[PDB]
Amino acid sequence: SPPVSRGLTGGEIVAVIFGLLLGAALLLGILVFRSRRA
Amino acid sequence: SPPVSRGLTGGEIVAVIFGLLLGAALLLGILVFRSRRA
User: Fold this and answer.
1) With an 8 Å Cβ cutoff, are A11 and B11 in contact?
2) Partner of B19 for a Cys bridge, out of A11, A16, B25, B38, CB 3.0 to 4.6 A?
């Protein structure tokens, strides 16, 4: 887990969690509103 | 979506899509594997 200039950087981590969280989160929501908003 | 700096970098983009793609993808799967594989 290097600082920078490598295949791993702070922006890379925060980026993955950003799309992974908002991605799955929003996905679940829409799925619930689809036809099971209980 | 600049090449560097500006709080936006190549690694940041690929990172978001990485967790976003695998995030929702894996999510939807488990949802169908739970008890509704139709």
Assistant:
1) yes
2) A16
